[PDB]
């Protein structure tokens, strides 16, 4: 309910190590809502960003996130065991079936990993939202938002938030979010990554966001935003975010979404 | 080896480390009034056995013994082996309410590619040249000869559990504190520089036991089958 997967911390004895242990089924998801592909629940990456960020930040103050690997998806189908490792400035997350006494250590299987780092909130602050006439954003109509974000992602989300105002240009969106859960970064990173595939041009595809390069958060989460979403220009499958509260200081930002 | 107190391996996702977790108890002993105090030669045999885990046989380097492991009830041990470092530690048993108590570590060590040709190499000191005059247990072992000089021993040990080499080890390391000269005190093992043994433990043995001349309260042992083939050696066994 933290929105993580870190359950119970565990410890190797005269070692720097930190483990968190956790079992994972369709009745334990640390999310509220439903991200399902047709009736295939996966945990939704920003459940690994918090994860990831929790287990980065645990003694010690806040971390930034870079080269955020997804590359296995997490299922919360049946049982599964659950495993968050931070060693040194490394986090990984990894699941396994459920050991018994036939096998009473399966493998792990690393679903993703990171590194921690320390966040660079000057960066952060110096940005900024690119210019609405600058860039042509037109305000879009509201059914159009709907199926165009229904069409790129997964049908329901993870959490709740909405979409109140969106703006849209050539390969950059600007949404005005609302996030009532200020519990959690979840809540807005998953609105982050699930409209960035809508700045994506031409026919709508249905993508999933496998690798980030940097994940930036400062503060508590609003409960207001506005989410900037810009595709990279030069390198394809790939879309940047910032967000800003609702006096536009920057408190998020998302470096190098890979969307493939 | 049946007298380790490996139990259950583990992993951690994305690295070489290996664990074991068991819990120690009362009913289920792998070898005073109500509490239990694991031998020494069990935390050698564990060490022995975590090191030679992809491996044939380790040897031990600098086994240190910092606090015995007690039990009056039921604890949890942990098993490390990082690299060519091995741990024991144990813990108040996790539930709900206390899901993460915190590990005291018992004794470490180092493994190292055992030495094997060098074992085969010692030999027995001679009787003559150092005068021997021919004159605990919770395992299956016994003294049934014995010739003492100054600052050696040799005993003939028998040891009909093969099953491991704990039983030979807690007579060596029980049988060590008596080649100390003056009057007997009772001491206990809190380092050991090396441990190698090699191939299966007779059921015959004779050990010999030698202070150190150079250094204080330390003892080195070998361990010899009948005809005087060693089987095993500890070097620099600390009994302070």
């Not at 050991?99 to 909130?121: F, G, I, Q």
């Not at 305000?139 to 909405?162: H, I, K, N, Q, Y």
């Given at each position: 309910?933290?929105?993580?997967?870190?359950?119970?911390?565990?410890?190797?004895?005269?070692?720097?190590?930190?483990?968190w242990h956790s079992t994972l089924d369709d009745?334990?998801?640390?999310?509220?809502?439903?991200?399902?592909?047709?009736?295939?629940?996966?945990?939704?990456?920003?459940?690994?960003?918090?994860?990831?960020?929790?287990?980065?930040?645990?003694?010690?103050?806040?971390?930034?996130?870079?080269?955020?690997?997804?590359?296995?998806?997490?299922?919360?189908?049946?049982?599964?065991?659950?495993?968050?490792?931070?060693?040194?400035?490394?986090?990984?997350?990894?699941?396994?079936?459920?050991?018994?006494?036939?096998?009473?250590?399966?493998?792990?299987?690393?679903?993703?990993?990171?590194?921690?780092?320390?966040?660079?909130?000057?960066?952060?602050?110096?940005?900024?939202?690119?210019?609405?006439?600058?860039?042509?954003?037109?305000?879009?109509?509201?059914?159009?938002?709907?199926?165009?974000?229904?069409?790129?992602?997964?049908?329901?989300?993870?959490?709740?938030?909405?979409?109140?105002?969106?703006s849209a240009g050539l390969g950059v969106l600007?949404?005005?979010?609302?996030?009532?859960?200020?519990?959690?970064?979840?809540?807005?990173?998953?609105?982050?990554?699930?409209?960035?595939?809508?700045?994506?041009?031409?026919?709508?595809?249905?993508?999933?966001?496998?690798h980030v390069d940097e994940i930036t958060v400062?503060?508590?989460?609003?409960?207001?935003?506005?989410?900037?979403?810009?595709?990279?220009?030069?390198?394809?499958?790939?879309?940047?975010?910032?967000?800003?509260?609702?006096?536009?200081?920057?408190?998020?930002?998302?470096?190098?979404?890979?969307?493939?």
């Amino acid at each position: 309910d933290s929105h993580t997967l870190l359950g119970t911390p565990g410890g190797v004895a005269g070692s720097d190590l930190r483990l968190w242990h956790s079992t994972l089924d369709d009745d334990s998801r640390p999310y509220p809502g439903s991200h399902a592909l047709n009736g295939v629940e996966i945990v939704p990456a920003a459940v690994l960003a918090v994860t990831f960020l929790a287990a980065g930040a645990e003694g010690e103050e806040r971390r930034a996130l870079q080269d955020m690997t997804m590359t296995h998806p997490v299922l919360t189908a049946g049982q599964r065991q659950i495993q968050v490792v931070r060693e040194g400035e490394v986090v990984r997350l990894a699941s396994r079936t459920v050991a018994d006494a036939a096998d009473p250590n399966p493998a792990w299987l690393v679903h993703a990993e990171a590194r921690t780092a320390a966040p660079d909130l000057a960066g952060l602050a110096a940005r900024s939202l690119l210019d609405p006439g600058e860039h042509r954003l037109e305000p879009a109509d509201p059914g159009l938002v709907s199926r165009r974000l229904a069409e790129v992602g997964v049908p329901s989300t993870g959490f709740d938030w909405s979409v109140e105002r969106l703006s849209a240009g050539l390969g950059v969106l600007h949404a005005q979010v609302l996030s009532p859960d200020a519990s959690s970064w979840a809540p807005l990173l998953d609105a982050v990554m699930s409209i960035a595939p809508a700045a994506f041009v031409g026919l709508p595809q249905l993508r999933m966001v496998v690798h980030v390069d940097e994940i930036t958060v400062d503060g508590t989460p609003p409960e207001a935003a506005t989410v900037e979403v810009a595709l990279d220009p030069r390198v394809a499958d790939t879309v940047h975010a910032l967000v800003t509260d609702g006096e536009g200081r920057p408190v998020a930002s998302l470096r190098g979404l890979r969307y493939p």
